[PDB]
Each structure stands twice: as C-alpha cells, then as structure tokens.
C-alpha cells in the first residue's frame, strides 16, 4: 500500500538512488497495478542522457534477474523495456537486441505460488513476445513510427 511505497522510498534513500533509478523502481514494483503510462514517458525522456541511460538499463537488468515471489519485478521490467524500445531513444532497442540471449532465458522462468497458481507462465508469455519483438527489424521500425504518429496527433490536438 503506502506502506509498500514507504519501504520503497526508504530503500531509495539508503542506496542514494538517482531520480531515473527511483522511477524505474516504481514502474517495476511488486505492486499489482501496471506501470503507469506517464511515469513511463518520463523514463523514456531520460534515455537520452548517457548517465540516466546507463542507470535505467542497469536497473532493468537487475529487475529482470529476480525470482519467485518477485515475478512481477520481471514481468514489469519486460513491459517497461517494450515501452522504451518503442518510444524512447533508439539506443535502448540497440542494446536490448545485443542482449537478446538474456531475455530468451526467461522462457524457462518458473513460479507457483502457495495457492498452487502458476504465476511464472506470465513471465514466459511476455518473454516470448519481447524476443519476437527484438528479432524483427521491420516490426521495430513500424512500432517506432506508430509511436511517433501517436505523439504527433496528441500535439496538433493540444
Ligand atoms: O518484503 P520482503 O520480503 O523484504 O521483499 C520485498 C517486497 O516484496 C517489496 O514489496 C519489494 O519492493 P517493491 O515494492 O519496490 O517491489 C522488495 O523488492 P526490492 O528488493 O527489489 O526493492 C522486496 O525485497
């Protein structure tokens, strides 16, 4: 709750995380609500700074390496990546393409919670899609155009 938020912030303070690291953490939290579209736009804007780009990619990597009951860290890190890939600096997709082998290993992520529900299949499902996104240059270009087309329409109508 505000209690998960509180602990998250204390962690931020202890580690002296940057603004970009704080944002990525929030977007990829264990909370059962999705990364907010506007927070995600702020992270996209930060991918054009070399320090913030390094921080963002490093924190995504960390989150992607989580396990078990923290599966939402991994799933949301994939969601964030897909968004950055389509809408941030093109450098994000270049780096993700070069590290495809690591997303590929998530095809075998497993987690069954205490009620016996398979939550890990969510990670496998998303990992397959992200790998299909990265392997296709033409689709990558078409998605980046469509994101700009969206931004352009939201700006002639504002
Ligand atoms: O309660 P525990 O067992 O200590 O486990 C933590 C808990 O799930 C938090 O909700 C989570 O932070 P978020 O809410 O930010 O997802 C945190 O992730 P973190 O270690 O990667 O920050 C965990 O370590």
Give helix 137-156 / helix 90-98 axis angle, nearest 10°.
160
Alpha-carbon distance 88 to 73, whole Å?
Answer: 21
30 CA to middle of ligand 1, Å? Answer: 7
Size of the chain in residues: 158
Alpha-carbon distance 136 to 5, whole Å?
Answer: 37
Q: Which residues contact 122 (CB under 8 A, 6 or more apart)?
A: 71, 75
Q: Resolution in angstroms for this experimental structure? A: 1.7
| DSSP-assigned beta bridge partners for residue 112 | 118
| DSSP-assigned beta bridge partners for residue 118 | 112
73 close to 28: Cβ distance less than 8 angstroms: yes
DSSP 33: S
Classify domain 1-158 at the CATH class level: mainly alpha
> Ligand 1 pocket by C-beta < 6 Å: which residues?
4, 8, 11, 25, 29-30
For residue 101, what are its two tokens? 């082998």
Sketch the domain layout of the chain as residue ranges. 1-158
Give me the phi and psi of 112, to 5 degrees please: -120, 125
Q: What distance, in Å, lies between the first and last C-alpha atoms of the chain?
A: 35
Pocket test of ligand 1: the residue of 3, 5, 7, 58 to mutate, having most ligand atoms within 8 Å of its CB, is 7
Alpha-carbon distance 140 to 60, whole Å?
Answer: 20
145 CA to middle of ligand 1, Å? Answer: 36
5 close to 22: Cβ distance less than 8 angstroms: no
Helix (H) or strand (E) holding 17: none
CA 104 to chain centre: 15
Experimental determination approach used = X-ray
Give me the phi and psi of 17, to 5 degrees please: -65, 150
For residue 11, what are its two tokens? 């962690």
Q: In this structure, which residue's CA is closest to atom 13 in ligand 1?
A: 29
Helix (H) or strand (E) holding 64: helix 50-64
Helix (H) or strand (E) holding 108: none
């Amino acid at each position: 709750m505000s209690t998960s938020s509180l602990r998250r912030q204390m962690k931020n303070i202890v580690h002296n995380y940057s603004e970009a690291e704080i944002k990525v953490r929030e977007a990829t939290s264990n909370d059962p609500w999705g990364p907010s579209s506007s927070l995600m736009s702020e992270i996209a804007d930060l991918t054009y700074n070399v320090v913030a780009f390094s921080e963002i990619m490093s924190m995504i990597w960390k989150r992607l390496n989580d396990h078990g009951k923290n599966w939402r860290h991994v799933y949301k890190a994939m969601t964030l990546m897909e968004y950055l890939i389509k809408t941030g600096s093109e450098r994000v997709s270049q780096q993700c393409k070069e590290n495809m082998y690591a997303v590929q290993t998530l095809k075998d992520f497993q987690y069954v919670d205490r009620d016996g529900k398979d939550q890990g299949v969510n990670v496998r499902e998303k990992a397959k899609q992200l790998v299909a996104l990265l392997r296709d240059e033409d689709r990558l270009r078409e998605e980046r155009a469509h994101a700009l087309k969206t931004k352009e329409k939201l700006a002639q109508t504002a």
